Amino acid sequence: KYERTYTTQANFILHGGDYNPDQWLDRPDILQADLELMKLSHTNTFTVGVFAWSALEPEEGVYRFEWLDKVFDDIYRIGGRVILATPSGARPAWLSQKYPEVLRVNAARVRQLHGGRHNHCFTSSVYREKTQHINRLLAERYGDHPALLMWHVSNEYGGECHCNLCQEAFREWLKKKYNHDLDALNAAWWTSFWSHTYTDWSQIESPSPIGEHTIHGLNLDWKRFVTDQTISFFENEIVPLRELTPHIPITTNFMADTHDLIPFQGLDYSKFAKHLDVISWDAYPAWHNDWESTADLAMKVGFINDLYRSLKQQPFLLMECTPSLVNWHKVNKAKRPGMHFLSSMQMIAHGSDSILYFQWRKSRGSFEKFHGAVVDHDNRTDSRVFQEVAEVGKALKKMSGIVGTNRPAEVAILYDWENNWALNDAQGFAAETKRYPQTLVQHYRPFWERDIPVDVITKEHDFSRYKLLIAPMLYLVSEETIARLKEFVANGGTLVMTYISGIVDEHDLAYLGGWHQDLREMFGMEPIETDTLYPRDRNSVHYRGRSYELKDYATVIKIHAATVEGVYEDDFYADTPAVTSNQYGKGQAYYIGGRLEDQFHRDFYQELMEKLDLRPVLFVKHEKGVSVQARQAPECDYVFIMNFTEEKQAVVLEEKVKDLFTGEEIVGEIMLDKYEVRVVEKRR
């Protein structure tokens, strides 16, 4: 099909980002300069009002919208658009002072004072009332303004409250979940252990470092409630948005948890996604760090992109990146010349219809005054950051055909938030080596190196759309999910699972009496022991004429109908099966019993690539470090050839294509400089 699917009314790639004139109302000269600089930076879309509550309502019921009126008209006049934010991300001081109930109580049951941001009690009726009301005012005043493009609801939702109100909300939530049956809750959580059985709903409290933290069922269900109540707060926020502005798409900005760029762990975005119109996220890779290559980092970014793109199977919106550096890393090193362009192109390549920044103009003071922005304190255009921002903008202006385009994949990696939660909470294995999302990226690596399109999906997605489904460490899995995987393989799908998959149900309750019969039958084997190793421990697995290094985990395997593809070579399970395959119905299922070195995954997945005919959208010959990614329109392929190394790289096109920017025809060998990106069109 390849039919374009737009997420906003914009038929151009958005460029710009967080704009905060509310910090400059006393500086009209700066405000005027902004418009001209926006034109010079080729930016067109600005996210306004994320923390402007005290600017909009300096005193309770006393409103000041005129500065905002003016910002709307001015941005419209230069041909810009506004992404309007609701301001719930930071309550005014007056509000905390008059309504203390909006201040959080943390898990150690300490009531917080006013300060910071993103930290309201998510249950408080007052904060729900106020936020919905100011949202209603905003939607009334600006809803049909021609500059408006999208709603940016709150900012970076996350965190928890453990106040009395929240305790009660949690009790009600549990009553709904377990159908008011305390026996069912007790059974699910296995509270007979350490005499924790609850005999009244009133007894149940959120987990705490000074209370109860030894009940996994309580811990998991608490995380679930935190997600549901967050989403509830959001719905309450958007009621006036849906009533008065049904024509305006709604998003909220997702995060990656620091360093490894893993999915945000504080909220189940797979559940949140269903409540949004378009997915948006905030990406802050620590480019040029000294513990990994540029390629590894880019590969991680690519993975997160494939995840947030896949949530709604439609273009996503990069809501935030820094055009230079951040303020809050251990080392706030700036992007090198070329790296900003490269990173931006990579966002487009994995499905983004925007390049948006935090921030437009560096705050003169306070916590993020040294966070990167388009415009430095010097107010110069004569700046490498500003110039490279302008170059990205000029490029995007030529890429409007890519807007709304999709990019189907034959390969999916299954990720599961609740599984991540339950696995991290589990007392077992080795705390420091569980590393679930990182492991997923290790299975992503061979496909990234081969430029094979991947979806990172959740159990909410249709499995059958794929030739290959990879589910590492699916430790927590429900019988429903199991049944769907069973169906997937039986109908012809290829399924790969690993060590520490299928241990536990959705209650974190161990599956009893051996492996679940469906898994045992699909895989033609079953795990009987997980061997957890110390850091210096090693094993190896011999596979296709090669011995591959094993660290961290091994699985003793009992064979039923399965073929043994590889074996362990040391320890008490030396020469026992380590890697298996099994024909099940029209499909196949592979078990990888140990954590093996990169080359193992290269060689193992190469076989499935050949067997299942997994190809890149457009083949490009290149060394490691060069990423080729594509987006597909009905009449053409758009292909990004990206040099994520600090060397020149020779690449080869086997087919003629057109440079998207210059029009130039191109085929054969070409040279990319360090961080160079070529964007090409190939006619279909």
Please state the residue numbers annotated as binding site: 117, 121, 155, 161, 163, 166, 328
* Binding-site residue positions for Zn(2+): 121, 161, 163, 166
DSSP string, 251-271: E-EE-EETTTTEEPSSS-HHH
Please name which of 641, 637, 590 lies closest in space to residue 612, comparing C-alpha atoms. Answer: 590
Among 235, 260, 277, 537, binds a second copy (CB under 8 A): 537
- Residues 278-337 contacting a second copy, CB under 8 A: 288-290, 325, 327-328, 330-334, 336-337
- Residues 121-180 contacting a second copy, CB under 8 A: none
The catalytic residue among 57, 160, 320, 388 is 320
Any idea which residue has 């119905």 for tokens? 585
**Is 426 a binder of a second copy (CB under 8 A)?**
yes
**Is 166 a binder of Zn ion (CB under 5 A)?**
yes
Q: Binding string, 541-580, against a second copy, x = CB under 8 A?
A: ------------------------------xx--------
- Residues 261-320 contacting Zn ion, CB under 5 A: none
Among 123, 251, 344, 580, binds Zn ion (CB under 5 A): 123
d(CA 354, CA 317): 5
Q: Is 565 a catalytic residue?
A: no
Whether residue 551 contacts residue 533, with contact meaning beta carbons closer than 8 Å, is answered with yes
Backbone φ and ψ of 607, nearest 5°: -60, -40
List the single partner that 112 binds among a second copy, Zn ion, none, CB under 5 to 8 Å by kind.
a second copy
Any idea which residue has 């309580």 for tokens? 218
List the single partner that 683 binds among Zn ion, a second copy, none, CB under 5 to 8 Å by kind.
none
The stretch among 25-33, 163-171, 625-633, 664-672 that binds Zn ion (CB under 5 A) is: 163-171
**Which lies closer to Zn ion via its Cβ, residue 109 or residue 558?**
109
Please name which of 185, 177, 190 lies closest in space to residue 204, comparing C-alpha atoms. Answer: 185
Among 378, 460, 462, 479, binds a second copy (CB under 8 A): 378
Q: Binding string, 491-530, against a second copy, x = CB under 8 A?
A: ----------------xxxxxxxxx------------xx-
Q: How far is the CB of 105 from a second copy (least distance, A)?
A: 10
Whether residue 112 contacts residue 105, with contact meaning beta carbons closer than 8 Å, is answered with yes
d(CA 198, CA 212): 12
- Residues 643-682 contacting a second copy, CB under 8 A: none
- 339-349 vs 384-397: helix axis angle to the nearest 10? 30
**Is 429 a binder of a second copy (CB under 8 A)?**
yes
d(CA 579, CA 114): 55
**Which lies closer to Zn ion via its Cβ, residue 119 or residue 305?**
119
Among 10, 139, 148, 161, binds Zn ion (CB under 5 A): 161
Please name which of 320, 307, 395, 397 lies closest in space to residue 350, comparing C-alpha atoms. Answer: 307
- Kindly state the DSSP code that residue 571 receives in the 8-state scheme: G
**Which lies closer to a second copy via its Cβ, residue 569 or residue 603?**
569
What is the dihedral sign for C-alpha 484, 490, 491, 494?
Answer: positive
Strands 649-659 and 620-621: antiparallel
Q: Counting beta carbons within 10 angstroms of the beta carbon of residue 187, is it exposed (0 to 12), middle (13 to 18) or buried (19 or more)?
A: middle
d(CA 225, CA 185): 14
Q: How far is the CB of 56 from a second copy (least distance, A)?
A: 9
Whether residue 150 contacts residue 83, with contact meaning beta carbons closer than 8 Å, is answered with yes
Whether residue 9 contacts residue 149, with contact meaning beta carbons closer than 8 Å, is answered with yes
**Which lies closer to a second copy via its Cβ, residue 405 or residue 643?**
643
- Residues 21-50 contacting a second copy, CB under 8 A: 22-23, 25-26
List the single partner that 471 binds among Zn ion, a second copy, none, CB under 5 to 8 Å by kind.
none
The count of residues interacting with a second copy (CB under 8 A) is 113
Q: How far is the CB of 175 from a second copy (least distance, A)?
A: 17
Q: Which residue is nearest to Zn ion (CB)?
A: 161
List the single partner that 290 binds among a second copy, Zn ion, none, CB under 5 to 8 Å by kind.
a second copy
Amino acid, res. 512 = L
Q: Cα 250 from chain centroid?
A: 17
Q: How far is the CB of 255 from Zn ion (least distance, A)?
A: 21
Q: Is 506 a catalytic residue?
A: no
Q: How far is the CB of 189 from Zn ion (least distance, A)?
A: 22
**For residue 278, what are the β-bridge partners?**
none
**Which lies closer to Zn ion via its Cβ, residue 81 or residue 162?**
162
Whether residue 251 contacts residue 280, with contact meaning beta carbons closer than 8 Å, is answered with yes
Which tokens belong to 209?
């470092």
Q: Give the per-residue SS3 of 199-231.
A: CCHHHCCCCCCCCCCCCHHHHHHHHHHHHHHHH
Amino acid, res. 161 = C
**Is 93 a binder of a second copy (CB under 8 A)?**
yes
Element (H, E) at 661: none
Among 4, 64, 117, 682, binds a second copy (CB under 8 A): 117
Query: Which sequence positions are flagged as catalytic?
Result: 156, 320
Interface with Zn ion (CB under 5 A): 121, 123, 161, 163, 165-166
